[PDB]
């Protein structure tokens, strides 16, 4: 139990750091995802990490 808790804490801190890195200073113009296009390799890697088909 106490190892899974440490893993959860580490992953939560990592996610917070990544969210802070993505976030910026004074807000800028937004580039919507519905207008940009993402490749298939990134999607495959992310879905495999998630644990889906």
């Amino acid at each position: 139990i106490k190892e899974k808790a440490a893993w959860i804490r580490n992953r939560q801190k990592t996610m917070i750091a990544e969210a802070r890195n993505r976030k910026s200073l004074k807000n800028k113009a937004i580039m919507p995802r519905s207008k940009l296009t993402k490749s298939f390799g990134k999607m495959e890697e992310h879905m495999s990490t998630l644990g889906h088909d």
Partner: protein, 59 residues
């Protein structure tokens, strides 16, 4: 690779100023051939030239 006129035409056609237009950095050669506003409209339709949304900042 001098897309100043292309940015001017995109800003005029979309009507959102030059601070809201986004020209694809990976399509410099394709945008370089858009010397007319019809080609600019075609690029905007294809998604090569995109219009940025207003900043999400509380009033």
């Amino acid at each position: 690779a001098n897309l100043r006129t292309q940015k001017r035409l995109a800003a005029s056609v979309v009507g959102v100023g030059k601070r809201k237009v986004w020209l694809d950095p990976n399509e410099t050669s394709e945008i370089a051939q858009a010397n007319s506003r019809n080609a600019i409209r075609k690029l905007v339709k294809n998604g090569t030239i995109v219009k940025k949304a207003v900043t999400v900042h509380s009033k």
